[PDB]
Paper text:
Using this strategy, we were able to purify CirpA1, A3, A4, and A5 and determine their structure using X-ray crystallography to a resolution of 2.0, 2.1, 1.8, and 1.9 Å respectively. Overall, the structures appear very similar, with the biggest conformational differences in the tilt angle of the C-terminal helix H2 as well as variations in loops between beta strands 4 and 5 (L4-5) and between strands 7 and 8 (L7-8). We identified three regions with high conformational variability between homologs. All these regions are part of the observed binding interface between CirpA1 and properdin, and hence the conformational differences might render other homologs incompatible with binding human properdin. Another CirpA1 residue undergoing a conformational rearrangement upon properdin binding is Y122 which forms a hydrophobic pocket around properdin P377 together with CirpA1 residues F122, Y131, and F150. This pocket is incomplete in all three CirpA1 homolog structures. However, it is likely that the homologues have evolved to target properdin from other species, especially given the identification of multiple CirpA homologues in a single tick species.
Author numbering: 48 to 59, 59a, 60 to 152, 156 to 172, 174 to 191, 191a, 191b, 192 to 203
Amino acid sequence: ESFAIDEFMNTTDDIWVLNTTQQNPQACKKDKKHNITENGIYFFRSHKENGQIKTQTLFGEFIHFSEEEKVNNRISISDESSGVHAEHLYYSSEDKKCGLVQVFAKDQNVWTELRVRGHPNYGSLDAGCRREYEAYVKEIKGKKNSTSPYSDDCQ
């Protein structure tokens, strides 16, 4: 099954990074969708350094490794501040409120982010998303560094 990244991000809600296997990730990481076209998605990527919010306008272009691919499950990003050049959504819940994104950066760092619509709460995360992220972090070859970039002090 393929999971469309333009449907998962087609919301006016903030998409927060709940969990990530990136080592030493930024704080209060989130995306805000600005526009979705047939060629890609314009959004605003933010994080918090020492109380201040840094934001950048990004355009993720839908890319396909063949001509038979039409599901928009992968985006290429240019001029990303952390060197992230590609993102691939490999799982998302049916209500599109949580997803697992494999992130490829230019420094050859590859990690996984568990993203959620709206700010993370202490309730019950979708069981499918949870078991999928558990399976991934269990499948990491040595030293799984899973942290949460979100805090209740993030606005």
